[PDB]
Amino acid sequence: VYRNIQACKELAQTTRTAYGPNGMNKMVINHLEKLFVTNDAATILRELEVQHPAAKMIVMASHMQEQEVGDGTNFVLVFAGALLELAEELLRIGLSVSEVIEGYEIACRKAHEILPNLVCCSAKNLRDIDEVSSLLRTSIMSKQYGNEVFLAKLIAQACVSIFPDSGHFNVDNIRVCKILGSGISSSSVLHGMVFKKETEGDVTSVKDAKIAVYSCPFAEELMNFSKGEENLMDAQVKAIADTGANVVVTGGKVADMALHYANKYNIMLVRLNSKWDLRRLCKTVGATALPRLTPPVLEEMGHCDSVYLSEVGDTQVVVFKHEKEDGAISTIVLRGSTDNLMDDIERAVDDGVNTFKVLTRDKRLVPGGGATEIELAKQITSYGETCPGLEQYAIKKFAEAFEAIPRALAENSGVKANEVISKLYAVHQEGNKNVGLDIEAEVPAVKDMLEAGILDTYLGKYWAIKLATNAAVTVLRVDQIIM
Amino acid sequence: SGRKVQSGNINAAKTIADIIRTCLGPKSMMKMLLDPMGGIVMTNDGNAILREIQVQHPAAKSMIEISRTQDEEVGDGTTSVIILAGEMLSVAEHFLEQQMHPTVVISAYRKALDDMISTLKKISIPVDISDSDMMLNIINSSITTKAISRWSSLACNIALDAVKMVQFEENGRKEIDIKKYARVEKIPGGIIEDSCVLRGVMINKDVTHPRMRRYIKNPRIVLLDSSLEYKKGIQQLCEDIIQLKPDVVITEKGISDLAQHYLMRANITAIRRVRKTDNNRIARACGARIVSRPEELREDDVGTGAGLLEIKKIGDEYFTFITDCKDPKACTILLRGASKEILSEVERNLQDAMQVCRNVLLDPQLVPGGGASEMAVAHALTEKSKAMTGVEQWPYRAVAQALEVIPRTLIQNCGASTIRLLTSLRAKHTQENCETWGVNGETGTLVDMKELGIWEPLAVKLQTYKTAVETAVLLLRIDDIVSGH
Amino acid sequence: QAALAVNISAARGLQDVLRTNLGPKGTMKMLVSGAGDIKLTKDGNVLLHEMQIQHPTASLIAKVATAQDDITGDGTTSNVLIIGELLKQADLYISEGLHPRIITEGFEAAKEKALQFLEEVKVSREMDRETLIDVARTSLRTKVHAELADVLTEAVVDSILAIKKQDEPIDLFMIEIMEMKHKSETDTSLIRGLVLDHGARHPDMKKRVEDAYILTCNVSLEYEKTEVNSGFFYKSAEEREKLVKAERKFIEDRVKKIIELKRKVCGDSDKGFVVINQKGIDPFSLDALSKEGIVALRRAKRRNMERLTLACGGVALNSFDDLSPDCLGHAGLVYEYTLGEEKFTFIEKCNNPRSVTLLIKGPNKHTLTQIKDAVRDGLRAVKNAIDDGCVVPGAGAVEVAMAEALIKHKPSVKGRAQLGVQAFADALLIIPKVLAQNSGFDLQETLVKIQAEHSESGQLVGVDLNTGEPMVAAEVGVWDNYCVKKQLLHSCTVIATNILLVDEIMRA
Ligand SMILES: Nc1ncnc2c1ncn2[C@@H]1O[C@H](COP(=O)(O)OP(=O)(O)O)[C@@H](O)[C@H]1O
Ligand SMILES: Nc1ncnc2c1ncn2[C@@H]1O[C@H](COP(=O)(O)OP(=O)(O)O)[C@@H](O)[C@H]1O
Ligand SMILES: Nc1ncnc2c1ncn2[C@@H]1O[C@H](COP(=O)(O)OP(=O)(O)O)[C@@H](O)[C@H]1O
């Protein structure tokens, strides 16, 4: 069993450092030989060729946590790693695995009811852009750098507060579009799906339009052949331009003859269609892909509202806004020096918007920065003495497992871990729950988060603790398999 | 290297501690000695285990030496000292890998030692002095589980009379005791009941021809390292001795018959072929003085000693009885039997009880054995560490969690599970405030030691704990071994 | 001479591998496939079926053990442990002579005595809900998480109690387990009736069909055309492009025949005409029939069709006509359910209420499979308990009592068969020892406590697998199946004898 615990320890260690706002970003090369630099732990786990079946269980637990809450994945990883370390030392003491399992389950049950007793909930509602953005600050603060958080929070919140209707939100509604070039400050909030285009024969004031989707991207005898090709192409463009079609998209490049025939129908020619854009268009307007030119029909055709060229961002873009709901889709324009940092910002925006979605169904906020972890550790380790028997060891180890989060959050910030843990635990008796770990000072000092506004969601913490405990338990109940 | 040498030192400590970790308690396991000739030795004593084995690491040699020095100073507890030192040095591994300095660990260990001393002095049960009741109770407690159970009826009263024969009244109330000045008389032959006690020094040497005034009703002994010759042509020394008029003058050279007559002219009795370990106790019990320089010779050269001398040839061998000595600090104890294989052990355990008695004069205290004291002090530390903060709280708690090794091994070399029993023992030792239970060494079951009847002297426990802590801090203070290999 | 020793070693190794699974506190094992798929389970049958065993005779033991276990309910790991301990005890004496025939005769005599003793030990307690709850708990806590087992007990016992109304041994066909991948695994209960695997692409035919009639007969709204003419679209393209037509007329004729049947037997557009096809159907005719109240469905497997025949009724054939309504059946509720993206057809309150399915909503594949196997084992255990109408104490109990009976019966037998009897007894001692070991206690201490308590009590006493002290299984509620014990004794004796009788290994 120690082999499984060792494998899980290694996999937790490889992503332990990326935890917290000062996470050390790693270099990532995938099988098609790119070169990323990313601090997002879920991204690291994606490109890790994890083969050990024991660590696969923790990876699946992390995926479930992300699939349901969208944040705290690395918390699940590090918590499971600490739990397995302490379970391993308990086993080395001589305790049976069953007793450790029972103690862990009892401790998790205790923590789940202790947790809702230390909540300082949301202020009034998802509205009041400034306040709610202040709530959404910590996630983006941690996931990407701590500098441009003040602007990224406003950018990511102004877009999501657009449609707080009936208390229902969807992550896919808030889309992100890439526009390279200027710095991040030039980014803003826009409405409706956006990408590039080529031609300029576009009409701005458009009623419910008609989208054509192209799934497949584009001496007398020579003259007669040229005439035949020209007439066939003209027949095809007439056949695709029938039924009052107004906009056409294709995944290929432009042709002078093709754009000329499109413009002679007063139709713009849109090109540069990405491998991912067609499905998004089909789901957003209820359209379909047409393989060849010869089968166009009115029924197999989706509907947009407005199409025009926007010069925002020092470049020409197309807009497909005001869908059936007329406000459902809400994009975010991003500006950056290259595309490598574009992905980091989009992951930060996603890790903010999903926290907002979680907050929609739960207004409870919990003091982050290690405050809740140390509080839970103190509560559980105090409860441990009240429970005699063989489960006290496992309960105490569960408390020490909660102790690991501020430890990592400090040691990956250039601060002595033991010193800050001791100071935090000592202060936490009198300087109660709302105190946590300060990042700014190089000296191991502590700072209150209720004043500093460093908070994280209750539901995320609850689900992460539950899933991490379940993963540790289900990986402790395995004997071996031939490998 | 840095902390690598610390880890090596404490690894040698651990690998030498677990060698004898199993051979304590009333159910000690045996060990195998395989000398490079083929011989094999049965052994229960870890002291002989360490003595016979050979080691190459200086740390191990130093710990063996400290175990010895504790052995011949206070008596028993060497295995406990080694086990405790190994356990603390092993639990220091966790902190030495925290990249945190040995100095703060050392300070935490010293604080823990002070608190353990305090809580032992708090938990110790009092005992009476000069009372045979709980003296025999202590005999049943500690002087038992030895080879004395068949001869305890004699060992007990031998020790109980021997407690008042080596007292020095220097600075307080009978707080000074010296160890070798008790006149041991171990002679086989006859029945063991013939062993008795006498107030005075018992000298196995005697004059060749005792046809002279050997015994005088007030021996005023004078010591001299000079050699007695025929005459001046040395009678001059005898003539100078006549000046102060003594009756007995002790030398360390042979005496002839004509020399005997020359001495009895001055009426002084000399002795020959005596030992320094006899001369020193003679002087101690008699308060005599040795001087031969004529300028220093004054009225102080003669010091009155005993008040009655006697010679008895019990079994055609030359004894010398010096009873009613001036100072009852070096007095006769008699040993009789057939073989010295057990009487030596019974003797040594009796002077162990003697040290018990003198500490009872200092601190008449007993600590509950069978792991009771260990878990009591561990609970005291663990509840004490709650209030205190700082980065050194972890070693402070770890010392407490490490000192519970004694009950753990007592349970282990009994058959019963060492986990459930320890957990139950702690459970009935924290919330149960005024109990201080222990573990039975025989059956491996928890039992209140006030009922079982096992107790240990306070002083031996204090010395063991202090030596263990000092050994741990010493091995943590060594930063380099290198002066060569 | 040596082949016997090889077999002994292999059986001991297999026993050691399987040791840490017996008992509800046993630790599960993980089966990773060569492809990469992972299966985590503890049931003895699946472990022996899916393990990659290396030793040949160990593979033989596993094969015969699973083959015999397919007969009775379960008890495979206990059987393997008993075989291993029997072989070790026998070898302990074979090492000092004792031609194996003597040990075999001792084994058969001990088997006869143990069967007799089990006959006098069985409990003939009657039928009730609570005892079967306890039986389900015993059979389920040994396969899955404790709380999940407590959840599953009620559903399993209620399903079997409902099926029991026929007063004949019936199972397997009449209880089916459905597979789906809902995130929340707490949703698990009985669905009286039948649930179809999937529906069809249909915009709002009926939703709540309520009372309706079922005819099936594999409607041919996408009737087989004449596409196959010569290979593919060859130079003679007008065949597969034009002769492929004229079959839509057959589809429309089937549509009017369905119309005639509907407004002939139904009497109105209501009273849904439930039909299911094994192949696809065009959405056009689908919605055309839907507007008339016809419940048209497609793309189902066979097993659901034969299930419908015995529950509701109806012929099955792709090409059909206006047949008689004799095969038509009626259902109380034909409500259709949908969860996110997949659609469920709840054919409920039908005639012949014997057909009942169970609902499980495990999050991942391996948890789903584990729950399915645990449910199957619980159903088999409760079925056996109802069939024999007699149950025996678990947690050992019977093992130690049979051991005492055999030991007191040892002087009765003559010859050297006493050695075989003693070996058989010490082998039956393995089960309480394995339970105590897997709990975390000491082997011999717990065994001595159990035997001593049984000595002056007489009543069956077993191991309490949370504290280690002896417990009477009747009061606590731990029960085993009498038929399982019978098959256990028979199979263990047979396999141990067969392994002991061998003398030489040769290639072939
Ligand atoms: N400014 C800060 N100071 C201290 N701790 C912080 C700060 N910002 C975030 N944290 C903590 O760092 C953690 C970051 O979680 P994160 O690594 O983003 O999880 P995931 O990557 O799975 O979304 C949060 O739980 C939060 O408590
Ligand atoms: N009858 C007994 N029951 C339980 N423990 C005992 C008993 N007798 C002695 N002990 C334990 O033995 C320990 C000391 O034995 P040990 O150190 O091996 O002897 P020595 O001091 O001569 O080396 C004490 O801690 C005491 O608690
Ligand atoms: N609650 C319980 N306490 C003690 N023993 C139990 C308990 N439940 C089941 N058992 C024991 O577990 C054994 C069955 O375990 P196992 O061999 O894994 O089942 P199977 O092989 O039939 O699938 C039974 O002999 C029974 O005595």
What is the rounded distance in angstroms from the CA atom of residue A72 to the CA atom of residue A59? Answer: 13
Q: How far apart are CA A158 and CA A332, in angstroms?
A: 10
CB distance C290 to ligand 3 below 6 Å: no
The one-letter amino acid at A210: K
Q: Is A426 helix (H, G, I), strand (E, B) or coil?
A: helix
Distance of CA B32 from the midpoint of ligand 2 (Å): 22
Instruction: Answer whether B160's CB lies under 8 Å from B138's CB.
Output: no
Give A94→chain B minimum CA distance, Å: 7
Residue linked to tokens 């039924």: A243
What DSSP state is assigned to residue B168? E
Q: What is the dihedral of CA B232, B235, B236, B237, to 10 degrees?
A: 130
Catalytic residues of B: 45, 78-79, 352
* C-alpha triplet A106, A109, A114: angle, nearest 5°: 125
What is the rounded CA–CA span in Å between residue B189 and residue A300? 124
Query: To which H or E segment does residue C392 belong?
Result: strand C391-393
Residues of A whose CB is below 8 A from B393: 422
Ligand 3 within 6 A of CB of C329? no
Pair of tokens at residue B348: 């040594």
Q: 3-class secondary structure for A360-391?
A: HCCCCEEECCCHHHHHHHHHHHHHHHCCCCCC
Q: Which ligand is nearest to the CA of C466?
A: 3
A99 touches chain C (CB under 8 A): yes
- Collect all residues of chain C within an 8 Å Cβ-Cβ radius of residue A283: none
- Please state, in angstroms and rounded to a whole number, the distance separating the CA atoms of residues A229 and A223: 10
Q: Would strands B183-186 and B332-335 be described as parallel, antiparallel, or unpaired?
A: parallel
Nearest-CB residue to C440 (from A68, A99, A479): A99
Q: Is A53 on the interface with C (CB under 8 A)?
A: yes
Nearest-by-CA chain A residue for C31: A481
Binding residues of B for ADP, by number, are: 25, 77-80, 145-146, 370, 441-442, 456, 461
A93 touches chain C (CB under 8 A): no
Task: Please tell me if residue A93 touches chain B, with a CB cutoff of 8 Å.
Answer: yes
CA of A105 to the centre of ligand 1 (A): 26
Q: Which residues pair with C350 in a beta bridge?
A: C331
> What is the experimental method?
cryo-EM
Q: Could you tell me where the beta strands, DSSP code E, fall in C26-155?
A: 29-32, 38-41
User: Which residues have CB under 6 Å of ligand 2?
Assistant: B 24-26, 76-80, 145, 369-370, 406, 410, 440-441, 454
Cβ-defined contacts of B431-436 (< 8 Å, 24+): B436/B123, B436/B368, B436/B372, B436/B373, B436/B376
Residue B228 and residue A422: Cα distance in Å, rounded?
Answer: 79
Of A165, A148, A161, A149, residue with least CA distance to A189: A161
Distant-in-sequence, close-in-space partners of C68: CB < 8 Å, separation ≥ 6 = C79, C487, C491
Degrees to nearest 5, angle at CA C418 with C413 and C421: 100
DSSP designation for B337: B
How many degrees, rounded to 5, is the angle at CA C336 between CA C332 and CA C339?
A: 145
| Identity of the amino acid at B224 | L
In sequence order, what are the residues at sequence separation of 6 or more whose Cβ sits closer than 8 angstroms to the Cβ of residue B194? B334, B336
Give CA–CA dist C71/A446, Å, rounded: 68
Resolution in A: 3.4
| Cα separation, C429 vs C423, whole angstroms | 10
| Residue A62 annotated as lining a ligand binding site | no
Residue A376 and residue A115 in contact, taking contact as beta carbons nearer than 8 Å:
yes
Instruction: Tell if the CB–CB gap between A419 and B391 is shorter than 8 Å.
Output: yes
Is A35 in CB contact (< 8 Å) with chain B?
A: no
How do beta strands C175-177 and C356-358 pair? parallel
A94 contacts B419? CB cut-off 8 A: yes
Concatenated DSSP letters of A139-179 = HHHHHS-SSTHHHHHHHHHHHHTT---TT---GGGEEEEEE
Pairing of strands C342-350, C175-177: unpaired
Q: Do C213 and C330 form a contact (C-beta atoms < 8 A)?
A: yes
Q: Measured in Å, how far apart are chain A's first and last C-alpha atoms?
A: 13
- Output the CA B145–ligand 2 centroid distance in Å: 9
Ligand nearest to the CA of C484: 3
Q: Is the CB of C468 under 6 A from ligand 3?
A: no
* Structure token digits, residue C272: 């849904």
Q: Does A388 touch chain B (CB under 8 A)?
A: yes
A92: closest chain B residue by CA: B419
Q: Is C4 in the pocket of ligand 3 (CB under 6 A)?
A: no
DSSP string, B218-277: S--EEE------S----HHHHHHHHHH--SEEE-SS---HHHHHHHHHTT-----S--HH
Please give the residue of chain B at the shortest CA–CA distance from A381. Answer: B386
Cβ neighbours of A31 (radius 10 Å) = 7
Helix (H, G, I), strand (E, B) or coil at C386: helix
Cβ contact B323:B204 at 8 Å: no
B393 and A422: CB-CB below 8 Å?
yes
Interchain CB contact of A35 with C (< 8 Å): no
**Contact across the interface for C364 and A60, Cβ inside 8 Å:** yes
**Touching check for A452 and chain C: CB below 8 Å?**
no
- In angstroms, the CA A70 to CA A463 distance is 11
Among candidates C28, C31, C32 on the partner chain, residue whose Cβ is nearest the Cβ of A477: C28
C-alpha–C-alpha distance, residues B223 and B251, integer Å = 6
Partner residue facing A479 (CB), from C29, C183, C364: C29
* Burial (Cβ within 10 Å: 0-12, 13-18, ≥19) of residue A327: middle
Residue among B390, B418, B420 whose CB faces A422 most closely: B390
For residue A389, what is the nearest residue in chain C, using CA coordinates?
C467
Can you spell out the DSSP letters for A245-283? --EEEESS---HHHHHHHHHTT-EEE----TTHHHHHHH
Structural contact between residues B24 and B83, judged by C-beta atoms closer than 8 angstroms: yes
The closest residue, in CA terms, to atom 22 on ligand 3 is C75
User: In angstroms, rounded to a whole number, what is the distance separating the alpha carbons of residues B389 and B349?
Assistant: 45
Task: Give the sign of the dihedral formed by CA C320, CA C326, CA C327, CA C328.
Answer: positive
Taking the centre of ligand 1 as the mean of its atom positions, its distance from the CA of residue A146, in whole angstroms, is 11
C355/A464 Cα distance (integer angstroms): 41
Query: Which residues fall within 8 angstroms of residue A200, CB to CB, at 6 or more apart?
Result: A268, A309
The CB of C141 under 6 Å from ligand 3? The reply is yes
Single-letter code of the amino acid located at B378: A
Pocket test for ligand 2, best of B31, B71, B79 (most atoms within 8 A of CB): B79
| Closest to B201 in 3D by CA, of B318, B333, B312, B313 | B333
Whole-number Å distance between alpha carbons of C114 and C116: 5
**Of C25, C28, C30, which is closest to A53 when you measure between CB atoms?**
C30
Residue A428's nearest CA partner among A384, A351, A371 is A371
User: How distant, in Å, are the alpha carbons of A374, A408, B431 from that of A380?
Assistant: 10, 20, 19
Put simply, the answer to whether A422 touches B389 (Cβ < 8 Å) is yes
Closest CA to B25 of B407, B286, B429, B450: B407
β-strand pairing of B289-290 with B221-223: parallel
What whole-number distance in Å separates Cα of residue C289 and Cα of residue C202?
11
Is the Cβ atom of A22 under 6 angstroms away from ligand 1?
Answer: no
Q: Which distant-in-sequence residues (6+ apart) come within 8 Å of C452 by Cβ? A: none
The subunits that touch chain C, with at least 3 C-beta pairs less than 8 Å apart, are A
